[PDB]
Structure formats: C-alpha cells, structure tokens
mmCIF file of all heavy atoms in Angstrom:
data_model
loop_
_atom_site.group_PDB
_atom_site.id
_atom_site.type_symbol
_atom_site.label_atom_id
_atom_site.label_comp_id
_atom_site.label_asym_id
_atom_site.label_seq_id
_atom_site.Cartn_x
_atom_site.Cartn_y
_atom_site.Cartn_z
ATOM 1 N N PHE A 1 -8.521 -11.936 7.918
ATOM 2 C CA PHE A 1 -9.687 -12.714 7.575
ATOM 3 C C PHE A 1 -10.807 -11.853 6.998
ATOM 4 O O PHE A 1 -11.498 -12.311 6.094
ATOM 5 C CB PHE A 1 -10.226 -13.296 8.867
ATOM 6 C CG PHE A 1 -11.216 -14.476 8.699
ATOM 7 C CD1 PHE A 1 -10.777 -15.739 8.333
ATOM 8 C CD2 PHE A 1 -12.595 -14.247 8.803
ATOM 9 C CE1 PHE A 1 -11.669 -16.783 8.133
ATOM 10 C CE2 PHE A 1 -13.522 -15.274 8.586
ATOM 11 C CZ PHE A 1 -13.060 -16.518 8.274
ATOM 12 N N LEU A 2 -10.957 -10.615 7.375
ATOM 13 C CA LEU A 2 -11.852 -9.674 6.737
ATOM 14 C C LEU A 2 -11.438 -9.230 5.395
ATOM 15 O O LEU A 2 -12.258 -8.730 4.636
ATOM 16 C CB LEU A 2 -12.107 -8.466 7.715
ATOM 17 C CG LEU A 2 -12.911 -8.747 8.956
ATOM 18 C CD1 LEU A 2 -12.910 -7.438 9.855
ATOM 19 C CD2 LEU A 2 -14.330 -9.209 8.660
ATOM 20 N N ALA A 3 -10.146 -9.344 5.027
ATOM 21 C CA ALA A 3 -9.710 -9.075 3.748
ATOM 22 C C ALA A 3 -10.081 -10.148 2.710
ATOM 23 O O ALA A 3 -10.387 -9.808 1.565
ATOM 24 C CB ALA A 3 -8.225 -8.898 3.736
ATOM 25 N N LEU A 4 -10.179 -11.445 3.203
ATOM 26 C CA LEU A 4 -10.692 -12.464 2.304
ATOM 27 C C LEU A 4 -12.181 -12.406 2.261
ATOM 28 O O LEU A 4 -12.821 -12.675 1.214
ATOM 29 C CB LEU A 4 -10.243 -13.868 2.837
ATOM 30 C CG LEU A 4 -10.650 -15.032 2.003
ATOM 31 C CD1 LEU A 4 -10.340 -14.847 0.518
ATOM 32 C CD2 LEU A 4 -10.012 -16.238 2.558
ATOM 33 N N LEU A 5 -12.849 -12.118 3.434
ATOM 34 C CA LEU A 5 -14.299 -11.872 3.374
ATOM 35 C C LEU A 5 -14.697 -10.650 2.620
ATOM 36 O O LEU A 5 -15.917 -10.605 2.195
ATOM 37 C CB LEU A 5 -14.852 -11.756 4.856
ATOM 38 C CG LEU A 5 -14.809 -13.055 5.721
ATOM 39 C CD1 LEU A 5 -15.532 -12.658 7.008
ATOM 40 C CD2 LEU A 5 -15.404 -14.185 5.012
ATOM 41 N N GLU A 6 -13.817 -9.743 2.405
ATOM 42 C CA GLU A 6 -14.182 -8.572 1.508
ATOM 43 C C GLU A 6 -14.271 -9.005 0.065
ATOM 44 O O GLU A 6 -15.187 -8.508 -0.669
ATOM 45 C CB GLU A 6 -13.112 -7.500 1.727
ATOM 46 C CG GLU A 6 -13.485 -6.145 1.056
ATOM 47 C CD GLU A 6 -12.834 -5.999 -0.317
ATOM 48 O OE1 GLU A 6 -12.112 -6.917 -0.746
ATOM 49 O OE2 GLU A 6 -13.125 -4.986 -1.036
ATOM 50 N N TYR A 7 -13.365 -9.894 -0.368
ATOM 51 C CA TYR A 7 -13.447 -10.454 -1.758
ATOM 52 C C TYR A 7 -14.694 -11.357 -1.907
ATOM 53 O O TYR A 7 -15.316 -11.312 -2.986
ATOM 54 C CB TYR A 7 -12.187 -11.087 -2.215
ATOM 55 C CG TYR A 7 -12.367 -11.622 -3.578
ATOM 56 C CD1 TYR A 7 -12.527 -10.670 -4.586
ATOM 57 C CD2 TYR A 7 -12.290 -12.998 -3.939
ATOM 58 C CE1 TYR A 7 -12.730 -11.118 -5.922
ATOM 59 C CE2 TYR A 7 -12.482 -13.416 -5.204
ATOM 60 C CZ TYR A 7 -12.683 -12.446 -6.219
ATOM 61 O OH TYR A 7 -12.862 -12.823 -7.493
ATOM 62 N N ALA A 8 -14.972 -12.159 -0.893
ATOM 63 C CA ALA A 8 -16.115 -13.050 -0.954
ATOM 64 C C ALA A 8 -17.413 -12.269 -1.062
ATOM 65 O O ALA A 8 -18.408 -12.789 -1.523
ATOM 66 C CB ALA A 8 -16.152 -13.961 0.172
ATOM 67 N N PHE A 9 -17.496 -11.032 -0.505
ATOM 68 C CA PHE A 9 -18.611 -10.236 -0.748
ATOM 69 C C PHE A 9 -18.570 -9.502 -2.094
ATOM 70 O O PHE A 9 -19.603 -9.251 -2.721
ATOM 71 C CB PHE A 9 -18.710 -9.117 0.410
ATOM 72 C CG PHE A 9 -19.968 -8.333 0.418
ATOM 73 C CD1 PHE A 9 -21.105 -8.929 0.963
ATOM 74 C CD2 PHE A 9 -20.019 -7.049 -0.158
ATOM 75 C CE1 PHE A 9 -22.306 -8.246 1.030
ATOM 76 C CE2 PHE A 9 -21.281 -6.399 -0.074
ATOM 77 C CZ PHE A 9 -22.359 -6.948 0.439
ATOM 78 N N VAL A 10 -17.336 -9.224 -2.551
ATOM 79 C CA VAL A 10 -17.146 -8.564 -3.913
ATOM 80 C C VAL A 10 -17.471 -9.640 -4.991
ATOM 81 O O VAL A 10 -18.197 -9.338 -5.959
ATOM 82 C CB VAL A 10 -15.740 -8.021 -3.982
ATOM 83 C CG1 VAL A 10 -15.334 -7.880 -5.439
ATOM 84 C CG2 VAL A 10 -15.655 -6.629 -3.370
ATOM 85 N N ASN A 11 -16.925 -10.846 -4.846
ATOM 86 C CA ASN A 11 -17.262 -11.907 -5.747
ATOM 87 C C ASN A 11 -18.698 -12.301 -5.827
ATOM 88 O O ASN A 11 -19.169 -12.824 -6.763
ATOM 89 C CB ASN A 11 -16.348 -13.141 -5.446
ATOM 90 C CG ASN A 11 -16.406 -14.248 -6.442
ATOM 91 O OD1 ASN A 11 -17.351 -15.077 -6.397
ATOM 92 N ND2 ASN A 11 -15.450 -14.206 -7.418
ATOM 93 N N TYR A 12 -19.415 -12.027 -4.674
ATOM 94 C CA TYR A 12 -20.838 -12.406 -4.596
ATOM 95 C C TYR A 12 -21.771 -11.416 -5.463
ATOM 96 O O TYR A 12 -22.830 -11.755 -5.841
ATOM 97 C CB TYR A 12 -21.287 -12.469 -3.202
ATOM 98 C CG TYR A 12 -22.708 -13.060 -2.930
ATOM 99 C CD1 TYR A 12 -22.913 -14.401 -3.290
ATOM 100 C CD2 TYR A 12 -23.655 -12.203 -2.383
ATOM 101 C CE1 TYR A 12 -24.184 -14.849 -3.053
ATOM 102 C CE2 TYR A 12 -24.953 -12.774 -2.159
ATOM 103 C CZ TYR A 12 -25.194 -14.083 -2.560
ATOM 104 O OH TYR A 12 -26.433 -14.635 -2.279
ATOM 105 N N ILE A 13 -21.249 -10.138 -5.569
ATOM 106 C CA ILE A 13 -22.067 -9.106 -6.131
ATOM 107 C C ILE A 13 -21.542 -8.477 -7.436
ATOM 108 O O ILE A 13 -22.141 -7.622 -7.985
ATOM 109 C CB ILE A 13 -22.339 -7.884 -5.119
ATOM 110 C CG1 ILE A 13 -21.004 -7.118 -4.845
ATOM 111 C CG2 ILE A 13 -22.838 -8.564 -3.761
ATOM 112 C CD1 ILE A 13 -21.249 -5.946 -4.049
ATOM 113 N N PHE A 14 -20.364 -8.881 -7.897
ATOM 114 C CA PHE A 14 -19.785 -8.196 -9.012
ATOM 115 C C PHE A 14 -20.348 -8.636 -10.360
ATOM 116 O O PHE A 14 -20.026 -8.001 -11.426
ATOM 117 C CB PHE A 14 -18.251 -8.438 -9.105
ATOM 118 C CG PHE A 14 -17.817 -9.773 -9.738
ATOM 119 C CD1 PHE A 14 -17.218 -9.686 -10.970
ATOM 120 C CD2 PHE A 14 -18.063 -10.967 -9.116
ATOM 121 C CE1 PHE A 14 -16.834 -10.845 -11.683
ATOM 122 C CE2 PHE A 14 -17.644 -12.099 -9.866
ATOM 123 C CZ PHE A 14 -17.082 -12.017 -11.021
ATOM 124 N N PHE A 15 -21.276 -9.590 -10.392
ATOM 125 C CA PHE A 15 -21.978 -9.828 -11.615
ATOM 126 C C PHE A 15 -23.232 -8.870 -11.765
ATOM 127 O O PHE A 15 -23.442 -8.303 -12.800
ATOM 128 C CB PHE A 15 -22.413 -11.282 -11.622
ATOM 129 C CG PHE A 15 -23.546 -11.615 -12.723
ATOM 130 C CD1 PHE A 15 -23.323 -11.534 -14.012
ATOM 131 C CD2 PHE A 15 -24.823 -11.904 -12.215
ATOM 132 C CE1 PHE A 15 -24.264 -11.799 -14.944
ATOM 133 C CE2 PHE A 15 -25.821 -12.161 -13.151
ATOM 134 C CZ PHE A 15 -25.537 -12.126 -14.520
ATOM 135 N N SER A 16 -24.069 -8.780 -10.710
ATOM 136 C CA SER A 16 -25.214 -8.012 -10.788
ATOM 137 C C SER A 16 -24.961 -6.516 -10.495
ATOM 138 O O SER A 16 -25.462 -5.664 -11.238
ATOM 139 C CB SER A 16 -26.271 -8.454 -9.755
ATOM 140 O OG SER A 16 -25.812 -8.215 -8.377
ATOM 141 N N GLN A 17 -24.023 -6.205 -9.572
ATOM 142 C CA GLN A 17 -23.658 -4.856 -9.246
ATOM 143 C C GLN A 17 -22.166 -4.675 -9.405
ATOM 144 O O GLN A 17 -21.392 -4.722 -8.426
ATOM 145 C CB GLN A 17 -24.143 -4.477 -7.715
ATOM 146 C CG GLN A 17 -25.522 -4.894 -7.457
ATOM 147 C CD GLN A 17 -25.860 -4.585 -6.001
ATOM 148 O OE1 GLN A 17 -25.874 -5.362 -5.156
ATOM 149 N NE2 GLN A 17 -26.176 -3.293 -5.767
ATOM 150 N N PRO A 18 -21.692 -4.382 -10.602
ATOM 151 C CA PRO A 18 -20.258 -4.165 -10.743
ATOM 152 C C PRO A 18 -19.739 -2.861 -10.348
ATOM 153 O O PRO A 18 -18.590 -2.726 -9.989
ATOM 154 C CB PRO A 18 -20.109 -4.282 -12.313
ATOM 155 C CG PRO A 18 -21.428 -3.846 -12.845
ATOM 156 C CD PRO A 18 -22.444 -4.264 -11.849
ATOM 157 N N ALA A 19 -20.584 -1.839 -10.226
ATOM 158 C CA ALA A 19 -20.191 -0.569 -9.783
ATOM 159 C C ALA A 19 -20.121 -0.500 -8.154
ATOM 160 O O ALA A 19 -19.274 0.132 -7.693
ATOM 161 C CB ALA A 19 -21.113 0.514 -10.205
ATOM 162 N N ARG A 20 -20.944 -1.282 -7.560
ATOM 163 C CA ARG A 20 -20.864 -1.404 -6.115
ATOM 164 C C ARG A 20 -19.656 -2.224 -5.706
ATOM 165 O O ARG A 20 -19.050 -1.833 -4.681
ATOM 166 C CB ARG A 20 -22.168 -2.037 -5.523
ATOM 167 C CG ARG A 20 -22.228 -2.118 -4.061
ATOM 168 C CD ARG A 20 -23.497 -2.847 -3.562
ATOM 169 N NE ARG A 20 -23.448 -3.070 -2.123
ATOM 170 C CZ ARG A 20 -24.446 -3.746 -1.491
ATOM 171 N NH1 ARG A 20 -25.485 -4.252 -2.136
ATOM 172 N NH2 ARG A 20 -24.340 -3.822 -0.141
ATOM 173 N N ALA A 21 -19.363 -3.293 -6.400
ATOM 174 C CA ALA A 21 -18.147 -4.094 -6.095
ATOM 175 C C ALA A 21 -16.883 -3.267 -6.383
ATOM 176 O O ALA A 21 -15.873 -3.625 -5.754
ATOM 177 C CB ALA A 21 -18.206 -5.399 -6.786
ATOM 178 N N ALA A 22 -16.907 -2.484 -7.390
ATOM 179 C CA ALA A 22 -15.677 -1.648 -7.611
ATOM 180 C C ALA A 22 -15.638 -0.523 -6.538
ATOM 181 O O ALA A 22 -14.445 -0.087 -6.250
ATOM 182 C CB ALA A 22 -15.810 -0.996 -8.955
ATOM 183 N N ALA A 23 -16.734 -0.177 -5.903
ATOM 184 C CA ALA A 23 -16.585 0.843 -4.794
ATOM 185 C C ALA A 23 -16.097 0.249 -3.543
ATOM 186 O O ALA A 23 -15.342 0.882 -2.781
ATOM 187 C CB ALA A 23 -17.978 1.409 -4.568
ATOM 188 N N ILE A 24 -16.405 -1.024 -3.250
ATOM 189 C CA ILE A 24 -15.920 -1.738 -2.045
ATOM 190 C C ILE A 24 -14.492 -1.927 -2.086
ATOM 191 O O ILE A 24 -13.690 -1.856 -1.176
ATOM 192 C CB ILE A 24 -16.801 -2.968 -1.848
ATOM 193 C CG1 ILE A 24 -18.177 -2.657 -1.603
ATOM 194 C CG2 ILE A 24 -16.248 -3.721 -0.611
ATOM 195 C CD1 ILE A 24 -19.079 -3.831 -1.565
ATOM 196 N N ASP A 25 -14.001 -2.242 -3.284
ATOM 197 C CA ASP A 25 -12.512 -2.430 -3.518
ATOM 198 C C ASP A 25 -11.824 -1.021 -3.367
ATOM 199 O O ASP A 25 -10.614 -1.024 -2.816
ATOM 200 C CB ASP A 25 -12.203 -3.028 -4.920
ATOM 201 C CG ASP A 25 -12.246 -4.535 -4.948
ATOM 202 O OD1 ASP A 25 -12.438 -5.078 -3.805
ATOM 203 O OD2 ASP A 25 -12.240 -5.116 -6.042
ATOM 204 N N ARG A 26 -12.380 -0.004 -3.832
ATOM 205 C CA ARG A 26 -11.831 1.310 -3.608
ATOM 206 C C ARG A 26 -11.895 1.748 -2.146
ATOM 207 O O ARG A 26 -11.018 2.438 -1.639
ATOM 208 C CB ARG A 26 -12.443 2.332 -4.554
ATOM 209 C CG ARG A 26 -11.941 3.753 -4.454
ATOM 210 C CD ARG A 26 -12.717 4.675 -5.331
ATOM 211 N NE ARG A 26 -12.444 6.083 -5.018
ATOM 212 C CZ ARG A 26 -13.080 7.131 -5.630
ATOM 213 N NH1 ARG A 26 -13.880 6.923 -6.631
ATOM 214 N NH2 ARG A 26 -12.747 8.359 -5.193
ATOM 215 N N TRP A 27 -12.981 1.365 -1.501
ATOM 216 C CA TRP A 27 -13.165 1.710 -0.076
ATOM 217 C C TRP A 27 -12.176 0.963 0.813
ATOM 218 O O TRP A 27 -11.702 1.486 1.765
ATOM 219 C CB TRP A 27 -14.599 1.439 0.336
ATOM 220 C CG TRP A 27 -14.910 1.603 1.763
ATOM 221 C CD1 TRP A 27 -15.164 2.810 2.382
ATOM 222 C CD2 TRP A 27 -15.112 0.646 2.787
ATOM 223 N NE1 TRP A 27 -15.449 2.617 3.715
ATOM 224 C CE2 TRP A 27 -15.402 1.290 3.988
ATOM 225 C CE3 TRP A 27 -15.039 -0.780 2.782
ATOM 226 C CZ2 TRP A 27 -15.612 0.632 5.198
ATOM 227 C CZ3 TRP A 27 -15.240 -1.422 3.983
ATOM 228 C CH2 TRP A 27 -15.533 -0.759 5.201
ATOM 229 N N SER A 28 -11.882 -0.328 0.466
ATOM 230 C CA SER A 28 -10.969 -1.158 1.236
ATOM 231 C C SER A 28 -9.506 -0.789 1.123
ATOM 232 O O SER A 28 -8.738 -1.217 1.922
ATOM 233 C CB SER A 28 -11.224 -2.605 0.893
ATOM 234 O OG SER A 28 -12.534 -2.971 1.121
#
C-alpha cells in the first residue's frame, strides 16, 4: 500500500519538483 502511495506522492510533485520526485524513486 505504501508502494502505491509512494507513486501518488511522486505523481503529485513530478511537475513542479522533477528532481525531488526522481530522488524518491531512487530512495524507494
């Protein structure tokens, strides 16, 4: 469930902060 919530946080921020969303995918 947290793996889907990880994308829902990534999908929420990857327009404004694409470097932060790429870091969360690397962190996960």
Side-chain angles (χ1 to χ4, degrees):
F1 196 82
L2 288 175
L4 181 53
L5 290 187
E6 190 263 357
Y7 180 60
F9 192 80
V10 157
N11 189 272
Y12 191 65
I13 71 172
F14 85 109
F15 164 70
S16 67
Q17 311 179 260
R20 183 185 175 181
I24 299 172
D25 276 352
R26 183 183 163 181
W27 177 78
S28 301

